[PDB]
């Protein structure tokens, strides 16, 4: 099957001034690319280990698969969660669910901002949908550990709090990056992911 | 290639009074049996997930693969690490290496006992060989995480401090179990594993 780097849905500068073109080009063409090439190499090594029944090799390969595999899963979602036409607030059933589960859109923003700022080290913040409980849920993931693979929650909106996503523009001030990114959230995509969870 | 439950190399009662027949039969015919079978189920799933390129499914299967795969790796070694012909002290180059790297055989016993008592929760203690440094090394692993797959060290002697290995006989007093097991260590097997590392 072989994983492939998806095209970005917009120009590298489409999210200016909130995320500059240099970050988008680096974050997409270098970081994400590395997560795909090394993921493909690791998957191929696993195929060899499985055919030989080498369980030691399978277990030794798990960290590279989760790190590079999670990186591929996460970034692919992140690009679609943003848009030059984004920002503002969602509408319809998604906004109703946000108000029901978090009180209000503003309170939801505070909680997701807090979870994203609260990641110590590298990782991600996610708004997800809990299919079994039938409601929204916020979770944090370290490094590149993907939400669904490690928690079962279906990802709706991810924020890449890695330093390579903002450090060139905002330096150490991650909160300024988190505030700015709300202006480019593609709520149309987040809604599609939400409606896909429900029948 | 399908993994198979190995026969025990001795009678269930061959290690009495140090480890009773009820433990050997349970620890082998129930616990290990579950690991091997569940490992095969997980491998078949992971093969299916790998062929589809489903990285989320692969990552969700990692805990079962490490737990059951490690269980198969560890226990298969553990049975060979014990023998009715065991006990006493090793000889030859392995004894020389123990004295060189740990000071004395008694000092090695103290270090491995300390590592085994020090496991908080379920896990194992291992004497291994570091191929890159060319010397022995003691390490502890949680749950069923295997030594080589998680550390690169080649396993020589493993001690199962899991509560299901001694609780029927020694209850909470793990040190009594650790004291007894030294009488049945198959140093011939440990020597073979050590000599297999050197060429
Ligand atoms: Mn990233
Ligand atoms: Mn056991």
Structural class of chain A: mainly alpha
Q: CATH class of the largest domain in chain A, anyone?
A: Alpha Beta
The biggest beta sheet of chain A, please?
3 strands, antiparallel
Strand element count of chain A: 3
Radius of gyration of chain A: 17 Å
Span between N and C termini of chain A?
A: 29 Å
Greatest chain-chain contact: A-B, 29 and 30 residues
Question: What ligands does this structure carry?
Answer: manganese (II) ion
Strand order of the largest sheet of chain A: 2-1-3
CATH superfamily of the largest domain in chain A: Iron/manganese superoxide dismutase, C-terminal domain
Q: How much helical structure, as a percent, in the residues of chain A?
A: 55-70%
InterPro entries (chains A, B): Fe/Mn_Superoxide_Dismutase (IPR050265), Mn/Fe_SOD (IPR001189), Mn/Fe_SOD_BS (IPR019833), Mn/Fe_SOD_C (IPR019832), Mn/Fe_SOD_N (IPR019831), Mn/Fe_SOD_N_sf (IPR036324), SOD_C_sf (IPR036314)
GO molecular function, one term (chains A, B): DNA binding
Modified residues (N6-succinyllysine) (chains A, B): 45, 52, 99, 107
Modified residues (N6-acetyllysine) (chains A, B): 45, 52, 91, 99, 107, 179
Key words describing this protein structure:
homodimer, 199 residues, mainly alpha, Helix Hairpins, 2 domains, 3-stranded antiparallel beta sheet, 8 helices, 55% helix, binds manganese (II) ion, oxidoreductase, MnSOD, SOD2
Brief characterization of the structure:
Chains A, B: It catalyses: 2 superoxide + 2 H(+) = H2O2 + O2. Chains A, B: It comes from Homo sapiens. The structure is a homodimer of 199-residue chains. Chain A is mainly alpha-helical and 199 residues long.
């Amino acid at each position: 099957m072989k994983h492939s780097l998806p095209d970005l849905p917009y120009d590298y500068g489409a999210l200016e001034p909130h995320i500059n073109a240099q970050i988008m080009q680096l974050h997409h063409s270098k970081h994400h690319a590395a997560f795909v090439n090394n993921l493909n190499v690791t998957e191929e090594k696993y195929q060899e280990a499985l055919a030989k029944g080498d369980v030691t090799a399978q277990i030794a390969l798990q960290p590279a698969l989760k790190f590079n595999g999670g990186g591929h899963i996460n970034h692919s979602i992140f690009w679609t969660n943003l848009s030059p036409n984004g920002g503002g607030e969602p509408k319809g059933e998604l906004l109703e669910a946000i108000k029901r589960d978090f009180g209000s859109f503003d309170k939801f923003k505070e909680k997701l901002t807090a979870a994203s700022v609260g990641v110590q080290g590298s990782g991600w913040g996610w708004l997800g949908f809990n299919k079994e409980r039938g409601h929204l849920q916020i979770a944090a993931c370290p490094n590149q550990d993907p939400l669904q693979g490690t928690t079962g929650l279906i990802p709706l909106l991810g924020i890449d709090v890695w330093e390579h996503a903002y450090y060139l523009q905002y330096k150490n001030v991650r909160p300024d990056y988190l505030k700015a990114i709300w202006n480019v959230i593609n709520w149309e995509n987040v809604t599609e992911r939400y409606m896909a969870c429900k029948k």
